[PDB]
Amino acid sequence: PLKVEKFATANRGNGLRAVTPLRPGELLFRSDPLAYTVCKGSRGVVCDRCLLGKEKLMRCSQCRVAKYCSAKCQKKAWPDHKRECKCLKSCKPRYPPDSVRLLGRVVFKLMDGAPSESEKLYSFYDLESNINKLTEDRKEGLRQLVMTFQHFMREEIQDASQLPPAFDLFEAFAKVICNSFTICNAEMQEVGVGLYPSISLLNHSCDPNCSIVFNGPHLLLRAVRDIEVGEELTICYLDMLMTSEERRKQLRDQYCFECDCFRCQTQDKDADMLTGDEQVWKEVQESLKKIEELKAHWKWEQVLAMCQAIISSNSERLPDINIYQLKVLDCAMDACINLGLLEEALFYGTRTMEPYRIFFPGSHPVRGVQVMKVGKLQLHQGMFPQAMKNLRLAFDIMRVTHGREHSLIEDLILLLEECDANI
Ligand SMILES: C[S@@+](CC[C@H](N)C(=O)[O-])C[C@H]1O[C@@H](n2cnc3c(N)ncnc32)[C@H](O)[C@@H]1O
Ligand SMILES: [Zn+2]
Ligand SMILES: [Zn+2]
Ligand SMILES: [Zn+2]
């Protein structure tokens, strides 16, 4: 039986609340997506279905846009790819925005598919759209998406009759804007985008009592604090490495609300996040736009070159607790891991440890994975005691955030065995 229930909140629409007392690490819900797709940067880098990277992917012979890691994945993806195939083919070489491909998959799923388990607590139809809060600029954006969708879908959908009854394309894209989940791989690289409508019941907190993790497109919702009966369940919608100003802008632009939490009222941590010379971190913040774009396209060599010019600059440097500096170190570490530059990766990774401890309090899956990456680097270098403390710390965090149902935990147990036996 469910440990969570939908309820109507006083001032933030519908939410989820505990039906029984919950402890850290308690599995609360598991969901596949109602619909999902690979993101623009990872298209052709990860399998369309299982979202795992591979040096060589096979492509769908009809559209040559969908790509897969194996015959099995291509075959199993076919029912949900079949109708989009003709639309993807007939629009080459124009590839649609991610949201447009995602909505295509929603419409086909709702038209041809059995009722989805993802919609057990809340369906696509119930999703919040924030229509009466959208700015004129946002509305103009949505109208362009509607027309893009109508074009993309021409081959399969000619009119309302082939859409679910009373389906409003404008309102559907509005739901997508505030309800899309970014799907991350085991290394916490963004690889996909999906709708998980039951999970969409979780309201936001900059200091949450729950967490979500992805294992391919499969999502796990876990408690990360003690939660009493009737208490609202919350997740953080946002990157932890953001100032209250940055959080304000995103919660406004994407989700149409103002956060009244304690952290927003007091600018909790903002001063520490922005230490170092303002001129310097402004330029770093600007450069990070290009760096993140490159990372999103798995361009590790170019990512590294740009990060090294900042980390080892001839001019003034930032403290590692500065969030822009911190992100640069994170990107540099990941580029080094993927390029096999393990010594350099470890230098960057170890410098991130204390700032991560500060910015990801309690149990957060991003800290757990970062700590696991550092311990794994230490283990490969044969620094067994330093490795063992980090692997154990990773396990303390990830047993709460990931749990036994996540395959990455089994990988970590192997690493602890390998390190413990060597000790
Ligand atoms: C993923 S949905 C969450 C469930 C939503 N309350 C509903 O009724 O369907 C995201 C939307 O919920 C509302 N919301 C989420 N967190 C909030 C918060 N902390 N304060 C006020 N509104 C919030 C905003 O309307 C936001 O766009
Ligand atoms: Zn696959
Ligand atoms: Zn195809
Ligand atoms: Zn807040």
Coordinates of C-alpha atoms and ligand atoms in Angstrom, one line a residue:
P1 CA 0.0 0.0 0.0
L2 CA 1.0 3.6 -0.7
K3 CA 3.0 5.6 1.9
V4 CA 2.0 8.8 0.3
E5 CA -1.3 10.5 -0.7
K6 CA -2.4 13.4 -2.8
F7 CA -4.0 16.3 -0.9
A8 CA -5.1 19.9 -1.6
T9 CA -2.7 22.4 0.1
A10 CA -3.7 25.8 1.4
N11 CA -1.7 27.9 -1.1
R12 CA 0.2 25.8 -3.6
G13 CA -2.4 23.7 -5.4
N14 CA -2.1 19.9 -5.0
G15 CA 0.7 18.2 -3.1
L16 CA 1.8 14.9 -1.6
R17 CA 1.8 14.1 2.1
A18 CA 3.0 11.1 4.2
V19 CA 0.3 8.6 5.2
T20 CA 2.7 7.0 7.7
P21 CA 5.8 8.2 9.5
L22 CA 8.8 8.1 7.1
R23 CA 12.5 7.6 7.9
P24 CA 15.6 8.7 5.8
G25 CA 16.1 6.3 2.8
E26 CA 12.5 5.1 2.8
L27 CA 11.3 4.3 -0.8
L28 CA 8.1 6.2 -1.4
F29 CA 7.3 5.7 -5.1
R30 CA 8.8 4.2 -8.2
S31 CA 7.8 5.4 -11.6
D32 CA 8.6 4.9 -15.3
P33 CA 7.8 8.0 -17.4
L34 CA 4.5 8.6 -19.1
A35 CA 6.8 9.8 -21.9
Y36 CA 10.4 10.6 -22.3
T37 CA 13.1 11.5 -24.9
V38 CA 16.8 11.9 -25.1
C39 CA 17.9 15.6 -24.8
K40 CA 19.4 17.5 -27.8
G41 CA 23.0 17.3 -26.5
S42 CA 22.9 13.6 -25.9
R43 CA 21.1 12.5 -29.0
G44 CA 23.4 10.1 -30.8
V45 CA 25.6 9.8 -27.7
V46 CA 23.2 7.7 -25.5
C47 CA 20.7 5.0 -26.4
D48 CA 17.2 6.5 -27.1
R49 CA 15.7 3.8 -24.9
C50 CA 17.9 2.9 -21.9
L51 CA 19.8 6.3 -21.9
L52 CA 23.3 4.7 -21.5
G53 CA 26.4 6.0 -23.4
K54 CA 28.1 3.9 -26.1
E55 CA 31.0 4.7 -28.5
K56 CA 28.9 3.2 -31.3
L57 CA 25.1 3.3 -31.6
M58 CA 22.9 1.8 -34.3
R59 CA 20.3 4.0 -35.9
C60 CA 16.7 3.4 -36.9
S61 CA 16.9 2.7 -40.7
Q62 CA 13.5 4.5 -41.4
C63 CA 14.2 7.9 -39.8
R64 CA 18.0 7.6 -39.0
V65 CA 17.3 9.9 -36.0
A66 CA 16.5 7.4 -33.2
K67 CA 19.7 5.6 -32.1
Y68 CA 20.1 2.6 -29.9
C69 CA 22.8 0.6 -28.0
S70 CA 21.5 -2.8 -29.1
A71 CA 18.9 -4.6 -31.3
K72 CA 17.0 -5.3 -28.0
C73 CA 16.6 -1.6 -27.2
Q74 CA 15.7 -0.7 -30.8
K75 CA 13.1 -3.5 -30.9
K76 CA 11.6 -2.7 -27.5
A77 CA 11.4 1.0 -28.3
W78 CA 9.5 0.3 -31.5
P79 CA 6.0 0.5 -30.2
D80 CA 6.6 4.0 -28.7
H81 CA 8.8 5.1 -31.6
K82 CA 6.6 3.9 -34.5
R83 CA 4.4 7.0 -35.0
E84 CA 7.2 9.6 -34.3
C85 CA 9.4 7.8 -36.8
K86 CA 7.5 9.1 -39.8
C87 CA 7.4 12.6 -38.3
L88 CA 11.1 12.6 -37.6
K89 CA 11.8 11.3 -41.1
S90 CA 9.6 13.9 -42.8
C91 CA 11.2 16.9 -41.1
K92 CA 14.9 16.1 -41.8
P93 CA 17.3 17.8 -41.3
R94 CA 15.2 20.0 -38.9
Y95 CA 15.1 18.4 -35.5
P96 CA 12.3 19.5 -33.2
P97 CA 12.8 21.2 -29.8
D98 CA 13.0 18.5 -27.0
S99 CA 9.6 19.6 -25.6
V100 CA 8.0 19.0 -29.0
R101 CA 9.3 15.5 -29.3
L102 CA 8.3 14.9 -25.7
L103 CA 4.7 16.1 -26.3
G104 CA 4.5 13.9 -29.5
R105 CA 5.3 10.9 -27.3
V106 CA 2.7 12.1 -24.7
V107 CA 0.0 12.3 -27.4
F108 CA 0.8 8.9 -29.0
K109 CA 0.9 7.3 -25.5
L110 CA -2.5 8.7 -24.5
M111 CA -4.0 7.8 -27.9
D112 CA -2.7 4.3 -28.5
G113 CA -1.4 3.1 -25.1
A114 CA -3.0 1.5 -22.1
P115 CA -3.5 3.7 -19.0
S116 CA 0.0 4.4 -17.7
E117 CA 1.1 3.4 -14.2
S118 CA 3.0 6.7 -14.1
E119 CA -0.5 8.4 -13.8
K120 CA -1.6 6.4 -10.8
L121 CA -1.9 9.4 -8.4
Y122 CA -2.3 12.2 -11.0
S123 CA -2.6 12.2 -14.7
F124 CA -1.4 14.4 -17.6
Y125 CA -4.9 16.0 -17.6
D126 CA -4.6 17.0 -13.9
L127 CA -1.1 18.6 -14.3
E128 CA -0.7 22.3 -13.3
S129 CA -0.4 24.6 -16.3
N130 CA -0.2 28.1 -14.5
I131 CA -2.2 29.6 -17.5
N132 CA -3.4 32.7 -15.6
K133 CA 0.2 33.4 -14.4
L134 CA 2.0 33.2 -17.8
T135 CA 3.6 36.4 -19.1
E136 CA 2.9 37.7 -22.6
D137 CA 6.5 36.7 -23.5
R138 CA 6.0 33.1 -22.3
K139 CA 2.6 32.9 -24.1
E140 CA 4.3 34.0 -27.4
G141 CA 6.9 31.2 -26.8
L142 CA 4.1 28.6 -26.3
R143 CA 2.3 29.7 -29.5
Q144 CA 5.5 29.1 -31.5
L145 CA 5.8 25.6 -29.8
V146 CA 2.2 24.8 -30.8
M147 CA 2.9 25.7 -34.4
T148 CA 6.2 23.7 -34.3
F149 CA 4.2 20.7 -33.0
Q150 CA 1.5 21.0 -35.7
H151 CA 4.2 21.0 -38.4
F152 CA 6.3 18.2 -36.8
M153 CA 3.2 16.0 -36.4
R154 CA 1.6 16.6 -39.9
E155 CA 2.1 13.0 -41.1
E156 CA 0.4 11.4 -38.1
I157 CA -2.0 14.1 -36.8
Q158 CA -4.2 16.2 -39.1
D159 CA -6.8 17.4 -36.7
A160 CA -8.4 17.3 -33.2
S161 CA -10.0 13.9 -33.8
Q162 CA -6.5 12.3 -33.6
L163 CA -5.8 14.1 -30.4
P164 CA -7.4 13.0 -27.1
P165 CA -10.9 14.6 -26.4
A166 CA -10.7 18.3 -25.5
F167 CA -6.9 18.3 -25.8
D168 CA -5.5 21.9 -25.9
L169 CA -2.1 22.1 -27.4
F170 CA -1.3 25.5 -25.8
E171 CA -2.3 24.2 -22.4
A172 CA -0.4 20.9 -23.0
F173 CA 2.9 22.8 -23.7
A174 CA 2.2 25.0 -20.6
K175 CA 2.0 21.7 -18.5
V176 CA 5.3 20.5 -20.1
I177 CA 7.1 23.8 -19.1
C178 CA 6.4 23.4 -15.4
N179 CA 6.3 19.6 -15.2
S180 CA 9.3 18.3 -17.2
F181 CA 11.8 16.3 -15.2
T182 CA 15.4 16.3 -16.3
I183 CA 16.6 12.7 -16.4
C184 CA 20.2 12.3 -15.3
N185 CA 22.4 9.3 -15.8
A186 CA 24.3 7.4 -13.0
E187 CA 27.1 10.0 -13.3
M188 CA 24.6 12.8 -12.9
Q189 CA 25.0 14.0 -16.5
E190 CA 21.7 15.3 -17.9
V191 CA 20.7 12.9 -20.6
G192 CA 16.9 13.1 -21.1
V193 CA 13.6 14.7 -20.3
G194 CA 10.4 13.0 -19.1
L195 CA 6.9 13.5 -17.7
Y196 CA 6.2 11.6 -14.4
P197 CA 2.7 12.9 -13.6
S198 CA 2.3 11.2 -10.1
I199 CA 5.7 12.6 -9.1
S200 CA 4.5 16.0 -10.3
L201 CA 2.5 16.2 -7.1
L202 CA 5.7 17.1 -5.2
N203 CA 5.9 20.8 -4.4
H204 CA 9.3 22.6 -4.2
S205 CA 11.4 23.4 -1.2
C206 CA 15.0 24.9 -1.2
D207 CA 15.4 22.6 1.8
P208 CA 13.5 19.4 0.9
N209 CA 12.5 16.3 2.8
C210 CA 12.6 14.0 -0.2
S211 CA 14.8 13.3 -3.2
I212 CA 14.4 11.7 -6.6
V213 CA 17.1 9.7 -8.5
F214 CA 17.1 8.2 -12.0
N215 CA 18.2 4.8 -13.0
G216 CA 17.9 5.1 -16.8
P217 CA 14.4 6.4 -17.3
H218 CA 13.2 4.7 -14.0
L219 CA 12.7 7.2 -11.2
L220 CA 12.9 6.5 -7.4
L221 CA 11.4 8.8 -4.9
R222 CA 13.0 8.5 -1.4
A223 CA 12.6 10.2 2.0
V224 CA 15.8 12.0 3.0
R225 CA 14.7 13.3 6.4
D226 CA 12.2 12.1 9.1
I227 CA 8.7 12.9 8.0
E228 CA 5.6 12.6 10.2
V229 CA 2.0 11.6 9.3
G230 CA 0.3 14.4 7.2
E231 CA 3.5 16.3 6.6
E232 CA 4.0 17.6 3.0
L233 CA 6.6 15.9 0.9
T234 CA 8.9 18.2 -1.0
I235 CA 11.8 18.0 -3.4
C236 CA 14.1 20.7 -4.6
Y237 CA 13.3 21.5 -8.3
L238 CA 16.7 23.3 -8.7
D239 CA 20.5 22.9 -8.8
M240 CA 21.8 23.4 -5.3
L241 CA 24.6 25.6 -6.6
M242 CA 22.5 28.8 -7.1
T243 CA 22.0 32.0 -5.1
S244 CA 18.6 33.0 -3.8
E245 CA 18.4 35.5 -6.7
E246 CA 19.1 32.8 -9.3
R247 CA 16.5 30.5 -7.7
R248 CA 13.9 33.4 -7.6
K249 CA 14.4 34.0 -11.3
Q250 CA 14.0 30.3 -12.3
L251 CA 11.1 29.6 -10.0
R252 CA 9.4 32.6 -11.5
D253 CA 10.3 32.0 -15.2
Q254 CA 9.6 28.3 -15.2
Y255 CA 7.2 27.6 -12.4
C256 CA 5.4 30.9 -11.8
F257 CA 5.8 31.1 -8.0
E258 CA 7.7 33.1 -5.3
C259 CA 9.5 30.9 -2.7
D260 CA 8.7 31.9 0.9
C261 CA 11.1 29.3 2.5
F262 CA 13.5 30.3 5.2
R263 CA 16.5 30.0 2.9
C264 CA 15.0 32.5 0.4
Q265 CA 13.9 35.0 3.2
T266 CA 17.5 35.1 4.6
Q267 CA 19.6 34.6 1.5
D268 CA 21.0 31.5 3.2
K269 CA 24.6 30.8 2.0
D270 CA 24.5 33.5 -0.7
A271 CA 27.5 35.4 0.7
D272 CA 29.7 32.4 0.8
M273 CA 28.6 31.4 -2.7
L274 CA 29.9 34.7 -4.1
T275 CA 33.2 35.1 -2.3
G276 CA 36.3 36.2 -4.3
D277 CA 36.6 39.1 -6.8
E278 CA 33.3 40.0 -8.4
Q279 CA 34.9 41.0 -11.7
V280 CA 36.5 37.5 -11.9
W281 CA 33.4 35.4 -11.0
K282 CA 31.3 37.5 -13.5
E283 CA 33.7 36.5 -16.3
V284 CA 33.6 32.9 -15.0
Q285 CA 29.8 32.9 -14.9
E286 CA 29.8 34.1 -18.5
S287 CA 32.3 31.4 -19.6
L288 CA 30.3 28.7 -17.9
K289 CA 27.5 29.2 -20.5
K290 CA 29.9 28.0 -23.2
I291 CA 31.4 25.3 -20.9
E292 CA 28.0 23.8 -19.9
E293 CA 26.9 23.8 -23.5
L294 CA 30.0 21.9 -24.4
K295 CA 29.5 19.4 -21.5
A296 CA 25.9 18.9 -22.7
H297 CA 27.3 17.8 -26.0
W298 CA 29.9 15.5 -24.3
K299 CA 32.8 17.6 -25.8
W300 CA 35.2 16.7 -23.0
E301 CA 38.5 18.0 -24.6
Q302 CA 37.0 21.4 -25.3
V303 CA 35.4 21.4 -21.8
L304 CA 38.7 20.7 -20.2
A305 CA 40.7 23.3 -22.2
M306 CA 38.2 26.0 -21.1
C307 CA 38.2 24.9 -17.4
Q308 CA 42.1 24.8 -17.2
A309 CA 42.3 28.4 -18.5
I310 CA 40.1 29.4 -15.4
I311 CA 41.5 26.9 -12.8
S312 CA 45.1 27.6 -13.8
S313 CA 44.7 31.2 -15.0
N314 CA 47.6 33.5 -15.1
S315 CA 45.3 36.1 -13.6
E316 CA 43.3 36.4 -10.3
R317 CA 41.6 33.2 -9.1
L318 CA 38.5 32.4 -7.1
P319 CA 38.1 30.4 -3.9
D320 CA 36.6 26.9 -4.4
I321 CA 33.6 27.7 -2.3
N322 CA 32.6 30.3 -5.0
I323 CA 29.8 28.5 -6.9
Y324 CA 31.0 29.5 -10.4
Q325 CA 34.5 28.3 -9.5
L326 CA 33.0 25.2 -8.1
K327 CA 31.0 24.3 -11.2
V328 CA 34.2 24.8 -13.3
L329 CA 36.0 22.3 -11.0
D330 CA 33.1 19.9 -11.4
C331 CA 33.1 20.2 -15.2
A332 CA 36.9 19.8 -15.2
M333 CA 36.7 16.7 -13.0
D334 CA 34.1 15.1 -15.3
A335 CA 36.1 15.9 -18.5
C336 CA 39.2 14.4 -16.9
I337 CA 37.4 11.2 -15.9
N338 CA 36.0 10.7 -19.4
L339 CA 39.4 11.5 -21.0
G340 CA 41.2 9.0 -18.6
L341 CA 43.2 11.8 -17.0
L342 CA 42.8 10.3 -13.5
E343 CA 45.5 12.2 -11.6
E344 CA 44.2 15.6 -12.8
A345 CA 40.5 14.5 -12.1
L346 CA 41.4 13.6 -8.6
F347 CA 43.0 17.0 -7.9
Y348 CA 39.8 18.8 -9.1
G349 CA 37.5 16.3 -7.4
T350 CA 39.2 16.5 -4.0
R351 CA 39.0 20.3 -4.1
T352 CA 35.2 20.0 -4.5
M353 CA 34.7 17.9 -1.4
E354 CA 34.5 20.5 1.3
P355 CA 32.4 23.0 -0.8
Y356 CA 30.0 20.0 -1.6
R357 CA 29.7 19.2 2.1
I358 CA 28.6 22.8 2.8
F359 CA 26.2 23.2 -0.2
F360 CA 24.5 19.8 -0.2
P361 CA 23.5 19.3 3.5
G362 CA 22.1 16.1 4.8
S363 CA 21.6 13.4 2.2
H364 CA 21.7 14.6 -1.4
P365 CA 22.3 12.3 -4.4
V366 CA 24.6 14.8 -6.2
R367 CA 27.0 14.9 -3.2
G368 CA 26.8 11.0 -2.9
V369 CA 27.8 10.5 -6.5
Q370 CA 30.6 13.1 -6.4
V371 CA 32.0 11.5 -3.2
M372 CA 31.8 8.1 -5.0
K373 CA 33.7 9.5 -8.0
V374 CA 36.5 10.9 -5.7
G375 CA 36.8 7.6 -3.8
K376 CA 36.8 5.6 -7.1
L377 CA 39.7 7.9 -8.3
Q378 CA 41.6 7.4 -5.0
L379 CA 41.1 3.6 -5.3
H380 CA 42.4 3.4 -8.9
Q381 CA 45.5 5.4 -7.7
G382 CA 45.9 2.8 -4.9
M383 CA 45.3 5.3 -2.0
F384 CA 43.3 2.7 0.0
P385 CA 42.6 4.4 3.3
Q386 CA 41.6 7.8 1.8
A387 CA 39.5 5.9 -0.7
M388 CA 37.8 3.8 2.0
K389 CA 36.6 6.9 4.0
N390 CA 35.1 8.4 0.8
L391 CA 33.5 5.1 -0.4
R392 CA 32.1 4.7 3.1
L393 CA 30.8 8.3 3.1
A394 CA 29.3 7.7 -0.4
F395 CA 27.6 4.6 1.0
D396 CA 26.2 6.5 4.0
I397 CA 24.7 9.2 1.6
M398 CA 23.6 6.9 -1.2
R399 CA 22.0 4.2 1.0
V400 CA 19.5 7.1 1.8
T401 CA 19.4 8.7 -1.7
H402 CA 19.7 5.7 -4.0
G403 CA 18.9 2.6 -1.9
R404 CA 19.1 -1.1 -3.0
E405 CA 16.7 -0.6 -5.9
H406 CA 19.2 1.5 -7.7
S407 CA 21.9 -0.4 -9.6
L408 CA 24.7 2.1 -8.7
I409 CA 24.5 0.9 -5.1
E410 CA 25.6 -2.6 -6.2
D411 CA 28.6 -1.0 -8.0
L412 CA 29.6 0.9 -4.8
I413 CA 29.3 -2.3 -2.7
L414 CA 31.8 -3.9 -5.2
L415 CA 34.1 -0.9 -4.7
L416 CA 33.9 -1.2 -1.0
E417 CA 34.7 -4.9 -1.2
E418 CA 37.7 -4.3 -3.5
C419 CA 38.9 -1.6 -1.1
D420 CA 38.2 -3.5 2.1
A421 CA 39.9 -6.7 0.8
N422 CA 42.9 -4.6 -0.1
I423 CA 42.9 -3.4 3.5
Ligands
LIG1 C1 5.4 20.0 -10.4 S1 3.9 21.0 -10.0 C2 3.6 20.6 -8.2 C3 2.2 20.2 -7.9 C4 1.2 21.4 -8.1 N1 1.1 22.1 -6.8 C5 -0.1 21.0 -8.7 O1 -1.2 21.4 -8.1 O2 -0.3 20.2 -9.7 C6 4.7 22.6 -9.9 C7 3.8 23.8 -9.6 O3 3.3 23.7 -8.2 C8 3.3 25.0 -7.6 N2 4.4 25.0 -6.5 C9 5.4 24.1 -6.4 N3 6.1 24.4 -5.3 C10 5.6 25.5 -4.8 C11 5.9 26.3 -3.7 N4 7.0 25.9 -2.9 N5 5.2 27.4 -3.4 C12 4.1 27.8 -4.2 N6 3.8 27.0 -5.3 C13 4.5 25.9 -5.5 C14 3.6 26.0 -8.7 O4 2.4 26.3 -9.3 C15 4.5 25.2 -9.7 O5 4.4 25.6 -11.0
ZN2 ZN 19.8 0.8 -24.8
ZN3 ZN 12.7 5.7 -36.8
ZN4 ZN 13.2 28.9 -1.2

